[PDB]
Amino acid sequence: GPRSVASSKLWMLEFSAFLEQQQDPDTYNKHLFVHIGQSSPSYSDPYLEAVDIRQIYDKFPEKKGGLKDLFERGPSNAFFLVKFWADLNTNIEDEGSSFYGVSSQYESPENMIITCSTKVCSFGKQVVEKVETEYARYENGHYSYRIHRSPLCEYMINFIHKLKHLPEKYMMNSVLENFTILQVVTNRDTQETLLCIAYVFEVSASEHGAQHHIYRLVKE
């Protein structure tokens, strides 16, 4: 059924990694690699509701501030795993100027200063870290937050480029099972973990394109 990536204090309405090519000053083509939103509603996996955190310890940051450490501190209802089936079927790099970015949107009942820390992991080790501080905008009784077109670094662009140009889907998948992202959204003043999302990847082979499932994170 439907799932929301939401804790008691923060909900992630949207998340998307994209490539935008400017053909001319008035013409833009945009390809979505991964996406969560109104166009791609979140659903659970009928075969697996939850993922035990012990099954993924080795794929994410270890020690203080790492996934295991964060989950133990809680709240439990702020921890999720997203599995993405990425759409790499684009040739929008070829012509014009390109922009790789990631955009995300959040809602909260409270007005907070939030910190979003995103860690890219290769073989379980942290390789890239991006930290962004966001402020609220009051809207319809709640508070809205947006990370608008946060740029991908040269290592993430190079990774995508080489991944797209592999001759086989199995090579793309053996590369992607070693690539993870850990997103932690925190209340900057209280240090409370508002949302913590562990992302795992596979290549999509659907005519519908990019797909995803939301899994609860548990320790049983």
Partner: peptide
């Protein structure tokens, strides 16, 4: 095909 070699030509200098 080596997944380790693929991630190494991207992150070998970044591994710290």
């Amino acid at each position: 095909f080596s997944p380790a070699d693929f991630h190494x030509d991207i992150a070998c200098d970044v591994a710290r």
